[PDB]
């Protein structure tokens, strides 16, 4: 039970994205940011025809920035479990969502997902 306030979510995400871009020229509590990151990545896997790729781009960017911003960098294992990781990769490569040249969320969404994954992996190493 619950309602997703999508307009509020979009406003807050873009505000947070601008702030995180500006700070990348205090710290972030990892023990608290872990829950935010988990909820964000769960939101990414819960998109459908009622959601748009425009919000997905900023969600991916904010997720990468938060994962790379906490002083102990968040690892991809701490973010998702095996089914969630398999679903996340299936968006990029799976034939359930990608049909011929028709990408899942478009070329921009595919590029954003790849950049998010690469940034999170680079943060760990």
């Amino acid at each position: 039970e619950g309602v997703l306030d999508i307009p509020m979510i979009s406003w807050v995400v873009m505000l947070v994205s601008r702030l995180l871009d500006y700070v990348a020229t205090f710290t972030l509590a990892h023990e608290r940011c872990i829950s935010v990151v988990q909820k964000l990545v769960l939101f990414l896997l819960s998109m459908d025809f009622t959601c748009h790729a425009d919000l997905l781009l900023f969600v991916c960017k904010v997720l990468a920035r938060i994962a790379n911003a906490t002083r102990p960098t968040i690892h991809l294992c701490e973010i998702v479990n095996e089914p969630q990781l398999e679903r996340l990769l299936l968006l990029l490569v799976g034939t359930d969502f990608n049909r011929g040249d028709i990408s899942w969320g478009g070329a921009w969404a595919q590029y954003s997902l790849t950049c998010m994954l690469q940034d999170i992996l680079a943060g760990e190493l």
Binding site: E86, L89, G94, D96, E124
Partner: protein
């Protein structure tokens, strides 16, 4: 302070699940290869010496080679991705005193079919005219892949790699082959022949040598006998004719004859 586990075990598990999923048409080859290449180079280029972060199982490589073998037709981008992936997997070390990954690739009969398909077929032909070549980038990728295969197998047994190379040349040069029909990318074949001339063939089987010599000799005899009756060369080109003794498909024929002289 707190100790966090690395993400590489579960990510390796996920990729192995994906690669084993190729044969049943659930995932796309090109997208999967791009994703693996991007995620395996985080510790910036396609350097052939980089060790992949992700590690694939032996069954994953076998399934990848199989799906390549029966794959209907590949675009050039797909072939470049395949060559880069194979080059990286050569550096990859199997873990599930085992045989080298390069050894598994060379001993796999499907690698012959993959290389023959790359060097014989082309991109599917639409109305738009495309050069019967492969471009410098794919040629360099193939050369790097072959160089990695030679480097990894030199310390254990170069004979198997040399026999592989000779079998590839024999299959290309045989009846209805790419060399006989002049179909595949000329530059790629020329560079493959160039890479062959610096090998050793130290402990190769003699039946393979005999078959290669027979095929090359028959091909060159056909090429000399059945040359065209019309010559139309540009002003810049000054290359001597094939039947001209004691002075770019000729470079391919000459390279083959330079190989027979070695054998």
């Amino acid at each position: 302070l707190i100790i966090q586990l690395s993400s590489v075990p579960m990510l390796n598990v996920c990729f192995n699940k994906l690669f084993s999923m190729l044969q049943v048409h659930h995932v796309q080859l090109e997208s999967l290869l791009q994703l693996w290449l991007t995620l395996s180079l985080n510790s910036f280029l396609y350097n052939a010496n980089r060790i992949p972060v992700i590690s694939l199982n032996q069954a994953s490589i076998t399934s990848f080679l199989t799906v390549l073998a029966w794959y209907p037709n590949t675009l050039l981008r797909t072939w470049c991705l395949v060559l880069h992936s194979l080059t990286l997997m050569t550096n990859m070390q199997l873990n599930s005193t085992q045989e080298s990954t390069a050894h598994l690739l060379v001993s796999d009969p499907n690698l012959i079919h993959v290389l023959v398909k790359f060097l014989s077929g082309t991109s599917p032909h639409g109305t738009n005219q495309h050069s019967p070549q492969v471009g410098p980038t794919a040629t360099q990728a193939m050369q790097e892949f072959l160089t990695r295969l030679q480097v990894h197998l030199s310390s254990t047994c170069p004979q198997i790699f040399s026999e592989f190379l000779l079998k590839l040349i024999h299959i290309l040069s045989t009846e209805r082959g790419a060399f006989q029909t002049g179909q595949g990318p000329l530059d790629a074949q020329v560079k493959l022949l160039e890479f062959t001339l610096e090998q050793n063939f130290e402990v190769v089987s003699v039946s393979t040598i005999s078959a290669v010599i027979e095929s090359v000799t028959f091909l060159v005899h056909h090429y000399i006998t059945c040359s065209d009756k019309v010559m139309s060369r540009s002003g810049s080109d000054s290359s001597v004719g094939a039947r001209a003794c004691f002075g770019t498909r000729d470079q391919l024929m000459f390279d083959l004859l330079k190989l027979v002289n070695i054998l």
